[PDB]
Structure formats: structure tokens, C-alpha cells
Design a protein around this ligand. Structure first.
Ligand code: NAP
Ligand code: NAP
Ligand code: NAP
Ligand code: NAP
Ligand code: E9P
Ligand code: E9P
Ligand code: E9P
Ligand code: E9P
Ligand code: GLU
Ligand code: GLU
Ligand code: GLU
Ligand code: GLU
Lengths: 255, 254, 254, 255
């Protein structure tokens, strides 16, 4: 691709291992202007330090907790005032309690079920609504999912039902916003060592199964997710919406 | 033959409810049935509808599935009243008109989370409570629609709630499998019911089935009920985590 | 209850055939059964396995599905001998043994087309001839495996033939639905049979089911048979173009 | 997606409307060296005229009928001697007799069913076996499918079963060749007016349905397929194998 003169919002960098920082490095290398969103103070401090690795001439950082309508609304409105219109959004945001994740699925609390839906699925819908205002000639929105949204995976529990909700959200958003020339798609990433992965029980056995069974016989990394994001966020994928691309060494295709 | 079987049926409002098709079939097969409801008006309908069944007695429980206490205490009383059960038919969903009748991107946070709560989470907590009355095993069936698998015009917030429900069925199947409790869904084709008045363009959905589905006709509540009898019985003993389309073959075409 | 129903069962070779689990179930339910075989050996095997069914007489027809004339003439004779039928169970597949181990990219043209011919095209031509014996409608069921949906090690050429068969089921559903003929598939979990010996690594396939499937056990032929009875009966009115997994839930997990 | 110093073999150009020619135009624009295979001499003649629109300094044209083991085997052997090792193959080849693309599917002949399997699915398998010989360090193999392989579509009939067969071929090949660092993927193209499309009954009503019902409300073109091929054929799609990308205006995702 070639992304000079384009601007993308990346939501959900926490540190150097985040899937979303792989996305940022790829887009930055390709010429894009980037805008970053975070929830914790600590995530902002990591962003400021990670920006030194990038070619970005200015820091554009906005605090946006996606539990709050007003923060998503005011945040995107401020972004539009600061950088003008945008070309797409990369959504790399999910959350569930340890306490629900690490017990039987049938014991999941209502509170923890709805928390995981709210942050990991509904956030895309409201982000799309606000981001559309900054994309009057169209644009591209990408969210990050996992195969536990399509099949029951041991231990992924409440988050597999949130990812199923997220993948349907992508399809319904693609149908709604398609007439505005806004494409919406998902990347189904293979397991990658991150801060959030520490919440998944048996994560090391999940990585070891990919090496042993997946067609490519190896795990993927953040930058490979980034390279598919660049495709999805750019005019290379102009015909493609409502799609879920598995960046997982082909694990999705085998049993 | 379901004699000496007992099933709980959740979600009859009136004679057109999909769950009443399920009841008629199970009743005809000899099952003892227990019914749950939310509104007073639904209990009144159930009382009238039971005169068409062969049930020697009315076993009726109010359970609003938005309340943990109601589900917990509801299934507790069912166990005291009738003993162990063999399965549960879940036929419950809800969403606001306000969110089936605005653009999907304009869905409210409270409307999205309401539909998830009633239409998806309810299965999880009902399974947790019902398992206490199934020590030997049993069978749980929920009702979904093809808009959980593909984006269908107007179905909007309910399609994301059914995608959530269908994953719920798979994760419950994995969890409760070792306890010998199967969990499955029936993906029913469109049927004129009270809830169907919330879906915009409903008559256009029905016509498209008669015109394009393999059987070239719509299904009815009794056909759902006949597939529920298979899922709830020993005929399906090998089958869990599955979604059977009772929809004249519409799911298979494009 | 299948009394006064008549079904043709294709693909019994011995006591371990999936189609023999089917036959035991349909028979127990009071169906009249017709059997087709390829080689005399399966005829004799059949003749003795029949001793264990309550079929008061032996309707046995040699049909090699590689031959149009045999399929055509065989179904014509069935009709003269017994009259109109209510359905067909198809349990027929083949691939050369060297094609069910090692490297898929080394598959010969001849063995790729052989597998397609026997394991997929044979459904098409059987449907066409059996339709003639179903003027009021009926039900056709074929046996498939999860290897038609996902690349499974060793299954190789048979995985591509099963993918072909599953699409075959869907196109036949669409074509034949207006004639009130339903066409569905059962995706059986691994079961030790004669043909099962041909598949590289079969024993490791079984183990993985016990360890990882939701029910934590393997299925058997009779469980495939009970789901066949559902698909072949009026209980599954409204269901066509479907693939029901009878696999302890293995399809639903990763 | 800079492809200078890459070489790709493109199979299945017949004329300017061919999907494989949209692929050719994109890969050539990106700097790749291109080799073309054809069956009919009239296709050779059209390639010769079409090369005048590309930046290729030489015509590398090989006649390969994929019904012939020898022609596939010798053609790829000849290709390796002329240009050396390659980076990937784009497979744009299918065939069925016209009477099997309208009316009733249950009436399909054995001979027409096996013909469509042979040309449209098995050809991928033998091409991958022969192409792997020219890709010692890895590579990428892309085939062209349709949604009729995943769902029963009116009139598509015998070709639907041949595309289901192709899509499983792609998966099994992905698994087999993954340890060799060969990726295998499909593109599921939406309907495009081509010489082959003339054999599909009701084709004009298929096109119209996409415009009326697909998320983007417009049909796709050959160049859009090409842009996705450039992605799948390049290092951008590392970590992606056994996948089927729909380039169809989102129509796959709706019902
Ligand atoms: N790692 C994997 O193996 C894997 C595989 C497939 C998919 N995914 C998906 O990839 C995405 C990114 O996760 P990751 O693995 O890169 O882990 P990560 O670095 O921990 O990133 C997760 C991000 O989510 C943000 N987040 C959580 N709740 C939020 C809220 N209410 N408002 C705003 N942001 C919030 C966190 O921000 P703060 O830290 O500031 O709170 C953090 O930046 C997630 O959707 C995840 O499910 C991960
Ligand atoms: N009709 C169709 O075309 C169709 C097709 C496919 C799937 N479905 C699904 O089929 C199921 C049955 O619906 P239906 O069409 O038969 O309509 P229905 O007759 O309106 O039944 C819907 C039921 O949901 C119950 N319910 C709603 N909220 C509840 C709550 N908070 N607590 C307890 N019960 C609650 C209602 O009870 P009250 O009236 O007492 O409040 C009512 O009995 C639903 O899951 C629906 O999504 C319907
Ligand atoms: N066993 C499993 O784990 C499993 C799992 C899923 C699906 N399946 C499927 O189940 C079906 C039956 O296999 P099985 O396991 O039951 O093995 P089986 O007992 O060996 O049955 C295979 C049958 O195919 C028949 N057959 C082969 N070619 C024929 C031809 N050209 N014309 C007529 N009949 C022909 C054989 O008849 P002859 O012996 O007379 O030649 C034999 O009766 C197959 O479709 C298989 O792919 C099996
Ligand atoms: N057009 C569409 O709407 C569409 C949509 C989705 C997928 N597809 C797929 O796209 C691919 C390309 O088709 P197209 O639409 O671009 O039509 P096309 O221009 O007619 O191309 C079809 C190609 O197949 C080649 N072919 C047929 N038999 C062959 C053989 N035995 N050996 C070698 N080559 C052979 C033809 O070569 P000769 O002319 O030299 O015989 C021709 O170049 C096909 O796989 C098709 O199924 C098309
Ligand atoms: C097993 C691969 C995987 C690892 C990390 C993930 O991110 C999470 C997980 C749970 C809560 C929040 C984010 C994820 O979705 C999938
Ligand atoms: C289009 C077929 C259809 C009709 C009715 C439904 O039930 C609902 C719908 C919305 C809210 C609550 C229940 C449903 O799920 C699917
Ligand atoms: C691995 C489960 C399985 C076992 C047996 C099968 O029947 C065959 C296998 C190969 C050739 C012919 C029939 C089958 O299809 C799948
Ligand atoms: C309806 C979209 C469509 C158009 C053309 C195609 O190419 C063919 C069709 C039949 C025989 C050979 C090639 C194809 O596969 C799909
Ligand atoms: N001991 C944890 C593993 C922690 C992790 O892998 O994230 C478990 O298996 O529950
Ligand atoms: N009147 C609704 C649709 C009515 C229906 O459910 O058929 C509309 O806005 O189209
Ligand atoms: N085919 C490209 C890269 C594709 C791959 O990632 O295998 C190459 O030969 O460099
Ligand atoms: N309309 C013709 C063919 C359409 C075309 O492919 O040009 C038919 O339906 O038979």
C-alpha cells in the first residue's frame, strides 16, 4: 500500500506488545498520520514513549473510555477539530473480569456478561456512529476478534460470546454504513503474547497447539496483524466489507 | 414417546407463541409440562390454552429472566413441586421498538444491553439453575433466527443478540457436556407471532420465503415443536452445540 | 412410528456399517426396508445380518453407483417389487487407499475423480431415480464427515469429496424442494468401520474426541440411526439442505 | 505491496474482460514479472494484444490445458527454465457444459459433473504440486471461487459443487504445503460480466440483486479482484492461509 495524506484513529494501545502497536508501526511506516486513543493514564505514558519509535511528527492522544457515550462523542468531535476528516479507525479494545473468565462458563455473572458485551462489542457500534461524521466521502473500520467467537474454546468463556456479538456487529454495521461508502471488517488474530492474554487460562497451551497443528506451524505476531490492517484500511480492499480475515497461520481452517 | 418425562417451557404469551407449538407436540407425546411466564396477561392465556392440552394439572411459574432471584427461586420451586426434570425449552427474547426501528449504527447502549440480557444471558443463568434438577443429564434448547448468522434488514439489535445466543449455546454445550446436558438451538423461519410485529418489513420476509426457499412455503409453530421434540429426547443423544434450521431450507440458499 | 413407511438403505457392508445402525433403528420403528449392495460379499453379509431384523422378507438389490444403468434399473425394479418409497439413506463412499495418508498435493487425477464419482455424484443420480418413486414427496439423507468442512490430517481426497457431497445436498434440496422431497446430511463423528481402516491415523482421531468433544465420548452407529429416523420422518418437516452433526459436539469446538 | 523482483504465473486469461486480466493489470503496475498460461490459441492471440497495455518487457506465454497431466508438468518445467523460480500462481480456471448451468441440477450427467470437477477443482491440486518445485523458499497460490460454492444459488448448479470442491482443495493444500512456507487462499469474487458468465442462466438478475441488496449497493470489477490478489500474493498477507476473501460488495454477509 501507500498511505500518505491518510489519517487513521487507533484505539487500544496499552504497551509495546499491544496488537494495536503492531498496527501503528505498519501504518506509520506506510506514510499515514495517526491519532491514538487510550483509557488509563499508564497507557498514555506508554504511547508518549512509543511515539519516539514512530515517524509521527506530532502526538495526537485522546482519552476515551468506551463505556462512556460522552467520552466517545466528545473525543471524536475533538479529533475532527484537531486533524480534520479521517480515513478509518482500528478498534483493538476488549475487556472481561478475571473472576468470570476463570470459572465455568455456566457460572458467568450477569454483571460480568454485560460488561464484556458493553466494552468488547457495543463500543464498536457507538465508535462507528461518531467516526462516520468524520468520513463524509467514506472510510474503513476494522475490529479485532478471535476464533473463540466462532467455536467454543476452553477458558475463553464470556469473551467468546462477546466476540460472537462483535462479529455480528461488524456485519450489521457493514450493511448499515455500506451506502455511505464505509466498509467494516474484522481481523481474527491468532494468539499473541499481550497484557490481556494473561487473563486467558492455559494461554501457553494455546500457543503450543498453533505451532504443532496450524498449517504454517508457527505463531503470528503483532506486525502480521498490522499488515492485514493496512490492506483492510486502504483502497486495496475496496470491494471487501462484512468480512472476517483470519491472521492465524491457517488454524481456522483445520480440525 | 415422552411419558415420564418432564420439560419446562419458557415464553408462551398466546396461542401463536412458538413455545405453544412446542407444548402441543410434547403434550401429544405424553410429557409432563411446566410453564413459565412474565406478564399477568400471559398467565391468563396459559390458563386458557391448557384446556387444549392433556395436562392433568396446571404448573405455572412467574419468571422474569431479568431477575436472578426470580430464575433461582423459580427453578427451586419447580424442583420442589415436580422433582427432577429432563429439559428446558427457552423461547424468550426482547428488544425495544425504539432501537428493529432505527438504523443499526444509531442503536442505544441501554437498548443493546437490554436485548443481550433478556435474549442471551437469560439462557446462561437458566442453564445454571436447571442443571440442579438434571443430575442424570438432560437437554436444553433455545430459539434463534438466521439474522444471528447474517445481517438481515431491520433485525438490527436482535441479530447481534442472536449471534450472542448461538455462541452461548456452544459454550454451554462444552461446559455442561461432561454432566450429560446437551444444549442446542433451533433456527426457526419467520412465523406470525406477537413479537414479530416488532420486526420492520415482516410480511416482506414471509413472502421472500414462499418465493425463494427450497420448500417454497413458510413453516409453522408445530414444525418447530416437532424438531424440539427430537432435540429434547433420546433421539438426538449424540447431538450438542448444534443449530438446526427449521426454515424450509432458506439458510442453505443465496 | 414408521409403520407403512418404506426406505431404501444403500451402503451396508457388514455389522459395523453405519448404514446397519440406521437399518436397526428404522426396523425397530416398524419401517419396511430395502437394501442395495455393490459386491456379493455384502449381499451374504446382509443376508445374515437380516436375521436380526424383524423384516419378514429380504429385498436386496445389487447396485454399483459407478453405473448409471444399474442405478436406473435397480430403482426401477425396487418400484415394481415394492411400489412407492418414502425415502433413501445413502451411506456410500470410496477413495484409493494411498490417497488417505501422506501428502494431498500428490493426489492423482484418477483417484481424485474416482472419489468424486462414488462419494458425491452418486447422490445426484440416486436422487433423480428415487424421485420417480416419491410422487407425494419424501426424504433423502447422505452421510458426511467434518473433513468436508475443515482440513483434517490424512483424510485428504475424501475431505474434498465430502465438501462436494455437502454442496450436492444443498443444490438437490433447492431443486427437489418444490416436489416435497427433502435432502439433508448427517455428519457422523468417527466410528470404527470397514472403510474407517483406510484412513491414516484413525485411532488418534477417536482419542481426540474423548479428550476434547463436549460429551467426552465417541458416538456409535445407532446414534447416527436415531438422527436418520428423525430426518427420514415427518418429525423433520421444514428441515432441508441441513447438515446435522452427530459427533458429541466436536464440530462446535476448537 | 511493491512487487519488483517478484515473478507470478497467471492462468486463465481469455480476453480483456477476464478476471485474470484485472489481476494482471494490478500486479504489472506493482512491478512484478508475469508469465501467462492459456488453453485455446484464440486466448494466446488476445494475450499478445493485451501485453501491449502492460509494462512487461517480454511475453512469457505457455499453452497449458489443465486436463493434461503432461501439459501442466512440462509447462511448469519449461517456465522454471525460462524465468527461474517464481513467487506465486494466480489460478483463474473453470469450465462446465452450458446445459449444466440452468434448469434442474438433479438431471446433471456423470460426464458433465466430472468434467467440471477436473478443470475447476483438481487442476488446482496438480498446479500446486508442479508450482511448488519452483518455490523452494515459499510462495503464494490464489484460486478464484464464487458464493455458489457455499450456498445453493439458482442456475449455478454443477459449478456450485465444483466450487465447494475447490474451496476444500484450498484448505487441504494450505495444510499440506504450509510447512513448505507455501500459502494457499481463495478469492470469492462477486458477479462480473465475462465470457464465462454468459453460460450462467439469469446472470443479469444476479448482477441487479447485488446492486439492490449488497451492503455497498454496487457491483465489483476485475481490478478490485486484482487488488485483493496483490494482497494475497505478497508479504502483506503473511500469516494468512486456507482463507477465502469475499470481494463481493459484502453480499456474502447478508441474507
Ligand atoms: N493477544 C491476543 O492473543 C488476541 C487474539 C485475538 C484477538 N485479540 C484482541 O485484540 C484486541 C487488543 O488486545 P491485546 O491482546 O492487544 O491486549 P492489550 O494490549 O491488553 O490491549 C487491550 C486494550 O483494550 C483497552 N480497553 C479495555 N477496556 C477499555 C475501555 N473501557 N475503554 C477503552 N479501552 C479499553 C485497554 O486500554 P487500557 O489498558 O488503557 O485500559 C488496552 O489498550 C482485543 O479486542 C482482543 O480481544 C487478542
Ligand atoms: N416468530 C418468529 O418468526 C421467530 C423466528 C425465529 C426465532 N424467533 C424467536 O422465538 C422466540 C419466541 O418468540 P415468538 O415469536 O414466539 O414471540 P412471543 O409469542 O412474543 O414470545 C416471546 C416471549 O418472550 C417472553 N419474554 C420477553 N421478555 C421476557 C422476560 N424479561 N422474562 C421472561 N420472559 C420474557 C414473553 O413473555 P411476556 O409476553 O410475558 O412478557 C413472550 O412469552 C424468541 O426467542 C424469538 O426471538 C421468533
Ligand atoms: N466410519 C466413520 O467414522 C464415518 C464418519 C463419517 C462419515 N462416514 C461415511 O459413512 C459412510 C459409510 O462408511 P462406513 O464407515 O459405514 O464404512 P463401510 O461399512 O465400509 O461402508 C462403505 C460402503 O460404501 C459402499 N460402496 C463403495 N463403493 C460403492 C460403489 N461404487 N457402489 C455401491 N456401493 C459402494 C460399500 O459397498 P461394498 O463393500 O459392497 O463395495 C460399503 O458398503 C461413507 O459415506 C463414509 O464416508 C463414516
Ligand atoms: N465472472 C464472474 O462473475 C466470476 C465470479 C466468481 C468467480 N469466477 C471464476 O473466475 C475464474 C475466471 O473466469 P472468468 O469469469 O474470468 O471467465 P473467462 O474470462 O471466461 O476465464 C475462464 C478461463 O478458464 C480457462 N479454461 C477453461 N478450461 C481450461 C482448461 N481446460 N485448461 C486451461 N484453462 C482453461 C479459459 O481458457 P480458454 O478460453 O483458453 O479455454 C479461460 O481463460 C473462474 O474460476 C470462474 O469460475 C467468475
Ligand atoms: C486466546 C487469544 C486471546 C488473547 C487475548 C485476548 O484479549 C482479551 C482477552 C480477554 C479479555 C480482554 C481481552 C483475546 O481476545 C484473545
Ligand atoms: C424475522 C423473524 C423473527 C420474528 C420474531 C422474532 O422475535 C423477536 C423479535 C424481536 C424482538 C423480540 C423477539 C425473531 O427473533 C425473529
Ligand atoms: C475419519 C472419519 C471417517 C471414517 C471413515 C470414513 O469412510 C470412508 C473413509 C475413506 C474412504 C471411504 C470411506 C469417513 O468418510 C470418515
Ligand atoms: C454467477 C457468477 C459467476 C460467473 C462466471 C463464472 O465462471 C464460470 C461459470 C460457469 C462455468 C465456468 C466458469 C463463475 O464461476 C461465477
Ligand atoms: N494458571 C492459569 C494460566 C494463566 C494464563 O495462562 O494466562 C490457568 O491455567 O488457569
Ligand atoms: N410498518 C413497518 C413494517 C410492518 C411489518 O412488521 O410488516 C414498516 O415500517 O415497514
Ligand atoms: N509470495 C511472496 C511472499 C508470500 C509469503 O508470505 O509466503 C514471496 O515469495 O516473497
Ligand atoms: N438469460 C439467459 C443467459 C444469461 C446470460 O448469461 O447472458 C438464460 O437465463 O438462459
Amino acid at each position: 500500500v501507500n498511505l500518505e495524506n491518510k489519517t487513521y484513529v487507533i484505539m487500544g494501545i496499552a504497551n509495546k506488545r499491544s496488537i494495536a502497536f503492531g498496527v501503528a508501526k505498519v501504518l506509520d511506516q506506510l506514510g499515514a498520520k495517526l491519532v491514538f486513543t487510550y483509557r488509563k493514564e499508564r497507557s498514555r505514558k506508554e504511547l508518549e514513549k512509543l511515539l519516539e519509535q514512530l515517524n509521527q511528527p506530532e502526538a495526537h492522544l485522546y482519552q476515551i473510555d468506551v463505556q462512556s457515550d460522552e467520552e466517545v462523542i466528545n473525543g471524536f468531535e475533538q479529533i475532527g477539530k484537531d486533524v480534520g476528516n479521517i480515513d478509518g479507525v482500528y478498534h483493538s479494545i476488549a475487556f472481561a473480569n478475571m473472576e468470570d473468565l476463570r470459572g465455568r462458563f455456566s457460572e458467568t455473572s450477569r454483571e460480568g456478561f454485560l460488561l464484556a458485551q458493553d466494552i468488547s462489542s457495543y463500543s464498536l457500534t457507538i465508535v462507528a456512529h461518531e467516526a462516520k461524521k468524520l468520513m463524509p466521502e467514506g472510510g474503513s473500520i476494522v475490529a479485532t476478534t478471535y476464533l473463540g467467537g466462532e467455536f467454543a474454546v476452553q477458558n475463553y468463556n464470556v469473551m467468546g460470546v462477546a466476540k460472537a456479538s462483535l462479529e455480528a456487529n461488524v456485519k450489521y454495521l457493514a450493511l448499515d454504513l455500506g451506502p455511505d461508502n464505509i466498509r467494516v471488517n474484522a481481523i481474527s488474530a491468532g494468539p499473541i503474547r499481550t497484557l490481556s492474554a494473561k487473563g486467558v487460562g492455559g494461554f501457553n497451551t494455546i500457543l503450543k497447539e498453533i505451532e504443532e497443528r496450524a498449517p504454517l506451524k508457527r505463531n503470528v505476531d503483532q506486525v502480521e496483524v498490522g499488515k492485514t490492517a493496512a490492506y483492510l484500511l486502504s483502497d486495496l480492499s475496496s470491494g471487501v466489507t462484512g468480512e472476517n480475515i483470519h491472521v492465524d497461520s491457517g488454524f481456522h481452517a483445520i480440525k
